[PDB]
Design a protein around this ligand. Structure first.
Ligand SMILES: O=C(O)CCc1nn2c3ccccc3n(CC(=O)O)c2nc1=O
Ligand SMILES: O=C(O)CCc1nn2c3ccccc3n(CC(=O)O)c2nc1=O
Ligand SMILES: [Zn+2]
Ligand SMILES: [Zn+2]
Lengths: 325, 323
């Protein structure tokens, strides 16, 4: 009974000329940001719609390369780090000790943005834009990612070796307000747009896979229930990031394109539901890149919250997903 | 059938200058005209001979095709190469002379070391190549037909990479010729339709070994008939070009199973022979350039190579063992 899923995927495409006009404003923001000494080498990372149900909301990431870093891990959190330096730092005014202050460099970031309005941050009638700034280190990835990104049986060890030569990024997130969180935003995009074991996956009629459709249906399912139960607040800590990482673990578990054939959209999606449910019950959802970081730990999400989402998802599947209508 | 063939590949594995190049890259970078200069085995039977190409990015180039040759171009344009201008043309004649001058005076500082060929105790051949980060020229539009093999997605990615121009006489002595040897390497080392080709026992393919055997067979015939000199104009580049066309014809990894090495190599030999007889071997990247036209290679030279190759294939390739 995948015809209901196929219909949903067609309506989600309906709500997709949606348009590129924040690329004007982001271009004008990027001009005066380079005029400052601290943000000279800042360029755009990639639109990127976090919410697949709100095409009128975008998200862009601004990257600034840092020349010389020695990273310092906060406690055993393995995802949050202190950024310490090894010429003349243009971010020397953001130094609180040996630690580049996240808060300091963010404050300057919003100031110049609030100075271009008269001509992290979210910008205004029916469109919004979420802006994030990230450090770029072209160095080797930290030791916590050594066992992550298990794509060797799927996209090959050769591709994993090439992806890990690319730079990694750090975004400002509290852990304590002096920490930076690892981010591989660029890698998840590259993998999803180059997702088959076959290099010609989805390029011909004989190799049509349903990986991308399963991810979309997964994100739509969570957003729909997040708005259905928007009052209880039990679902507020659940985001499409959790759904994406679970989908990537499923791709690792099912590496052949034979296991994602478009005919089997029903079972593929159902197996994506099931793995997500299993992570909820056992309270275990490892970061795809940082395998010892548990997104579904009791420290970050309450068990009662996961039990409510499990109950609702199981209800939806048992009744042919009325959430989609 | 692959018994003798695999025994030949096992010998070629057993048979497998850094400093000299590094000391040359520094004293060359000291010159203004060659400020941006960086790094980027031609023979399988001569492992005491290496091959290296030095790249130098030229910022903004305006190419002009020389008389519908599709491969040779004049390069027109704070310019560090204005010393080598002969009007508005970057004269390859003057560019390659200043190149040899710095090297010839630098191998004086290893005290015996004698485009340019170095002799050590071992031989190294150095080539100079301008790099343009622009889009590839129009003569290349229909080349690199890898869409059914390595995917159109990959073809557009490789097409975003820079191309290179090498000083080669066309004779007009200041023309530059297109070069994509960097693309050839990436295709050869990432060669399957499946990204895990040759990464497990289930997906073992015989593409790389098929090309090695074709290069070996050519290099051996060259040594065998080196006196008569009919085979001097042939080279590994012709063999590699025919191989890439066979990869385009046979895009599935199942048509290259390691079990079928005998059939695959015989098919690779057969297509190369077809290129010889019909005198047609398109450049893989510039399809309108025929490497086997009678302008470049004598037809009797191709008929001599055909006769020799056809004898070897009919007699289980005896030339693989004689030397
Ligand atoms: O991938 C990106 O760059 C942004 C998306 C994203 N990454 N991310 C984490 C990455 C590492 C560790 C914890 C992380 N958390 C914790 C959370 O879910 O709050 C988190 N949430 C996110 O939304
Ligand atoms: O750098 C590269 O592209 C590979 C090396 C290489 N390229 N190349 C040619 C490229 C275009 C036209 C003719 C070409 N010929 C033979 C010839 O001049 O007829 C040739 N021999 C070579 O060894
Ligand atoms: Zn696909
Ligand atoms: Zn292979």
């Amino acid at each position: 009974g995948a015809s209901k899923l196929r219909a949903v995927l067609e309506k989600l495409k309906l709500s997709r000329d949606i348009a590129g006009m924040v690329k004007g404003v982001v271009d004008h923001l990027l001009l005066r940001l380079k005029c400052d000494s601290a943000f000279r080498g800042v360029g755009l990372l990639n639109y990127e719609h976090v919410k697949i149900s709100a095409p009128n909301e975008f998200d862009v990431m601004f990257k600034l390369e840092v020349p010389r870093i020695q990273l310092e891990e906060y406690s055993n959190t393995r995802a949050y780090y202190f950024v310490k330096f090894k010429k003349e730092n243009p971010l020397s005014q953001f130094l609180e000790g040996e630690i580049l202050s996240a808060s300091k460099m963010l404050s300057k970031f919003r100031k110049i943005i609030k100075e271009e309005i008269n001509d992290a941050v979210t910008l205004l009638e029916k469109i919004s834009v979420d802006i994030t700034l990230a450090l770029e280190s072209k160095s080797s990835w930290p030791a916590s990612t050594q066992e992550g990104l298990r794509i060797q049986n799927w996209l090959s060890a050769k591709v994993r070796k090439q992806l890990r030569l690319k730079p990694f990024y750090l975004v400002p997130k509290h852990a304590q307000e002096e920490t930076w969180r690892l981010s591989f935003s660029h890698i998840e995009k590259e993998i999803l747009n180059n997702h088959g074991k076959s290099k010609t996956c989805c390029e011909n009629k004989e190799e049509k896979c349903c990986r991308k459709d399963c991810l979309k249906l997964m994100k739509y399912l969570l957003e729909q229930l997040k708005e259905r139960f928007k009052d209880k607040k039990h679902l507020d800590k659940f985001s499409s990031y959790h759904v994406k990482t679970a989908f990537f673990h499923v791709c690792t578990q099912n590496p052949q394109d034979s296991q994602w054939d478009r005919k089997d959209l029903g079972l593929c999606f159902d197996n994506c539901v099931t793995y997500f449910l299993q992570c909820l019950r056992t309270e275990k959802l490892e970061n795809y890149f940082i395998p010892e970081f548990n997104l579904f730990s009791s420290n970050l999400i309450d068990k009662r919250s996961k039990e409510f989402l499990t109950k609702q998802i199981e209800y939806e599947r048992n009744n042919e997903f009325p959430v989609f209508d």
